[PDB]
Design a binder for this molecule. Sequence first.
Ligand SMILES: *[C@@H]1O[C@H](CO)[C@@H](O)[C@H](O)[C@H]1NC(C)=O
Length: 341
Amino acid sequence: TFPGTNGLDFTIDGTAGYFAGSNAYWLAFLTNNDDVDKVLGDAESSGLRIMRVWGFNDVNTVPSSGTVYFQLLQDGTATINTGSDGLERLDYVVSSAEQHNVKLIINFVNNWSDYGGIPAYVNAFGGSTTSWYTDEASQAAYRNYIKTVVSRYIDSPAVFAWELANEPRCHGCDTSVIYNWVAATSSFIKSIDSQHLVCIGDEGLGLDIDSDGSYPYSYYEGTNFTLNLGVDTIDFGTFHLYPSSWGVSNSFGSPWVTAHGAACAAAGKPCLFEEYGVTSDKCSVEGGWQQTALDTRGIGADSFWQFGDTLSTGQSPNDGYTIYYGTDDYTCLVTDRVASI
Ligand SMILES: *[C@@H]1O[C@H](CO)[C@@H](O)[C@H](O)[C@H]1NC(C)=O
């Protein structure tokens, strides 16, 4: 039975529960299978049921030999890499997730320039980071890429959800730009695969319910959380949380979770608290957020940003948010936490 929803709860194998997960954006960019297995086994033994990974890796020129990439976007043409240093790495991750009782969230483009993103489509096809949503050349490539990836794992019970993008924004755009794109893209996915969950991947910006007046609740980044969540072909909401990056205090975080949970409840769909992080005082600050998420109606799961581990190639990436397996912060925010759910 694939992961699903039942009212405000998520389900895995047909059973409802609150699920803890993490993010490991880089998992399908490794080239060592043993390291993939270590990460997913460490997640599994720690009680992480969901892992969110990048399902994209867009380049404007072919990288060095040995470097993983999933799509070359160059001079008006897309070329998808299905070889051993292309989407076969994502294949191994899905296989390993099936062997390790981990369900994956797999997304299809970045908002940001990291690993190409909407900027790499602009470089290849023209336009701008706001026009992208409605530009024919970009959207055709994007959809073809989506169909290419979805078709690889259409029958896998290890896919939690297909996710449109990482943190899509449309700065200054009418909120209908993203809304129509969400509706069209999610309907496209459901036309290919009627059975897996689909979500957006946005940060949750643009929310009137329980607003504190601060900028994250405004609609000027192009997203309207309640509007988009009403799309029939989206199964659950996503929101992220970075107070200092956003110009707000950490005290905004728990109320941000409360406000999104209320919005999810109103929509009749679960919310995934899909990224959150601070770079210091993690146990205390993130622990507070985690408790709010467990206590809030409509929050069905959460996944901290980000998982860390020791790989054969060295420590996995440290962006200051990384919580490494075997450390005290990992005990606080993962192993203790999951055991107590
Ligand atoms: C956000 O969507 C809600 C519907 O869920 C709508 O009532 C509100 O007007 C929208 N606001 C903007 C600026 O899109």
